[PDB]
């Protein structure tokens, strides 16, 4: 049975601070250059979720302690990877996954035409 070949994939890693995300991106680009894949990486804009809470509980409306939620984004632009290579890369990434990051995998597979598409029946 033929193997599936993937086109592009955007496995981005988000973190609260900056140092751990930079170190993870450096480790990722090292693991990429030590194989022969040659990937790219840029810095998308960040987002900060803010919400205001009451400092006390009684008649103290003049004092409010707000809280933010700083997070960053660093996506990896991978190119030319088959199914087995992508699975091995995902395995090696998950084996060294931190305890405070996210990971979404969006791999697009390649295919010419299915069986019933030219002259199908119902």
């Amino acid at each position: 049975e033929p193997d599936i070949l993937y086109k592009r994939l955007s496995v981005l890693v988000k973190g609260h601070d900056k140092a751990v995300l930079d170190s993870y991106e450096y480790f990722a680009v090292l693991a990429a250059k030590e194989l022969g894949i040659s990937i790219k990486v840029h810095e998308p804009p960040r987002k900060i979720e803010r919400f205001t809470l009451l400092q006390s509980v009684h008649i103290y409306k003049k004092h409010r302690v707000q809280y933010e939620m700083r997070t960053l984004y660093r996506c990896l632009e991978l190119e030319h990877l088959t199914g087995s290579t992508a699975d091995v890369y995902l395995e090696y990434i998950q084996r060294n996954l931190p305890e405070g990051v996210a990971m979404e995998v969006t791999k697009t597979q390649l295919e010419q035409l299915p069986e019933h598409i030219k002259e199908p029946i119902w």
Binding site: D87, L90, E91, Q94, R95
Partner: protein, 120 residues
């Protein structure tokens, strides 16, 4: 049956290896079934009873004891359009809903007869 247990215990005793590093720790954790299979996939334990898409989307095979014209057929088309675009339910829930609708229609037969329509 006890001889097989004794033989398995002897095998486990003669084939034991003390843990040297964290690699054996993670190997034992994976073989025991604790972490997720690392090919992290949203299909393990979520096959939805192996029902295909022709039973989820196309609900034409559930329109037998219902007329083709009138408000009854309109309500049937409405509930079919509603269930066909429901990714949270499955085929069993739709079958149960159709059965409950059929039971509700058969329980109140005089209402359907006096509703200016003939329940076929």
């Amino acid at each position: 049956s006890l001889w097989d247990v004794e033989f398995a215990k002897q095998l486990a005793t003669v084939n034991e290896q003390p843990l040297q590093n964290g690699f054996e720790e993670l190997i034992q954790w994976t073989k025991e079934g604790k972490l997720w299979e690392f090919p992290i996939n949203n299909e393990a334990g979520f096959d939805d009873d192996g029902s295909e898409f022709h039973e989820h989307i196309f609900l034409e095979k559930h329109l037998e004891s219902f007329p083709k014209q009138g408000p009854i057929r309109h309500f049937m088309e409405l509930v079919t359009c509603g269930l066909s675009k429901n990714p949270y339910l499955s085929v069993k829930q739709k079958v149960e809903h159709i059965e409950w609708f059929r039971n509700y229609f058969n329980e109140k037969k005089d209402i359907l007869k006096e509703s200016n329509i003939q329940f076929n």
